[PDB]
Amino acid sequence: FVVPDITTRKNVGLSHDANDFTLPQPLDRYSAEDHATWATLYQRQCKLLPGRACDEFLEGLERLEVDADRVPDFNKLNEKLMAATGWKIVAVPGLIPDDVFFEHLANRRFPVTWWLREPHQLDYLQEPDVFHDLFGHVPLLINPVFADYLEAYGKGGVKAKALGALPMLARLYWYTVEFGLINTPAGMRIYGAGILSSKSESIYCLDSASPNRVGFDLMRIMNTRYRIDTFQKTYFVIDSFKQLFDATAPDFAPLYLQLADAQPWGAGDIAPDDLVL
Numbered sequence: 576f577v578v579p580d581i582t583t584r585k586n587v588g589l590s591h592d593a594n595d596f597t598l599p600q601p602l603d604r605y606s607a608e609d610h611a612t613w614a615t616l617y618q619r620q621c622k623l624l625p626g627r628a629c630d631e632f633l634e635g636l637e638r639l640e641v642d643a644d645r646v647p648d649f650n651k652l653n654e655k656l657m658a659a660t661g662w663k664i665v666a667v668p669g670l671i672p673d674d675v676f677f678e679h680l681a682n683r684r685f686p687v688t689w690w691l692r693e694p695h696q697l698d699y700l701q702e703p704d705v706f707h708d709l710f711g712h713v714p715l716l717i718n719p720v721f722a723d724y725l726e727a728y729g730k731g732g733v734k735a736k737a738l739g740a741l742p743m744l745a746r747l748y749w750y751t752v753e754f755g756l757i758n759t760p761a762g763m764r765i766y767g768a769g770i771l772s773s774k775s776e777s778i779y780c781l782d783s784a785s786p787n788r789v790g791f792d793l794m795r796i797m798n799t800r801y802r803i804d805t806f807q808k809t810y811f812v813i814d815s816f817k818q819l820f821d822a823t824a825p826d827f828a829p830l831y832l833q834l835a836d837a838q839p840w841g842a843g844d845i846a847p848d849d850l851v852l
């Protein structure tokens with residue numbers, strides 16, 4: 576009744592560092608099928624995302640020379656990424672402990688799951704994979720304000736861990752880095768990686784009247800649950816990456832303590848103070 580999960584299967588014969596969870600990218604393990612899956616996913620998103628993704632995202636794909644036709648060589652991408660904002664990507668086996676993830680970000684390393692979904696999982700994979708982590712997350716690292724936000728978020732891990740507040744930080748990450756929307760004069764656009772790599776959440780999040788699109792509010796967000804197994808019911812909207820960086824700059828310690836005994840909002844709740852857009 577129990578079978579090895581995709582993370583376990585993909586990593587057989589491989590190792591990882593016991594402290595930081597990294598390994599050299601195993602290039603020999605990508606089959607022709609992997610490159611074809613990558614090319615299909617990349618083509619699909621590049622057709623769907625113009626006028627949906629924020630323009631910075633599309634520019635990042637191009638400036639970083641993210642390969643269209645094969646899984647990218649992480650070292651090669653790093654040459655461009657390092658020159659831009661002093662970040663690099665590191666390969667990891669899949670999901671890693673929160674404190675290790677934060678320590679990477681604090682040091683301007685972005686952890687990327689090395690392996691790719693199988694063609695049968697083309698439409699959707701639950702686990703992060705190299706398409707979601709690299710295509711979805713990495714292009715916005717060219718934006719210096721976004722990159723500074725990620726670094727600051729990483730640095731925030733130490734205080735959060737010490738206060739038992741990692742789930743509150745996780746909610747902020749989920750509702751920004753993973754599933755954030757950004758308002759523009761041309762209309763709302765997408766910056767969250769979990770939407771940018773998705774087959775159809777990119778359509779729903781902008782085109783459907785169903786989800787609630789709520790103005791960013793730090794306390795609301797850190798008090799809001801999310802689910803990992805369907806489309807989001809609430810998206811939070813920033814006005815700029817600068818607004819995001821500034822709103823998250825103050826001391827979170829009093830915010831964590833006030834939220835500690837609070838009843839969190841459900842993934843589909845509208846709070847009394849929400850700016851609903």
Ligand SMILES: N[C@@H](Cc1ccccc1)C(=O)O
Pocket residue numbers: 724727728729730731732734735747823824825826827828
């Ligand atoms: N300002 C937060 C750190 C942080 C920065 C950016 C994003 C998330 C958290 C703190 O006091 O710990």
Ligand SMILES: [Co+2]
Pocket residue numbers: 591
């Ligand atoms: Co292990």
Ligand SMILES: [Co+2]
Pocket residue numbers: 703707708712753768769
């Ligand atoms: Co992600």
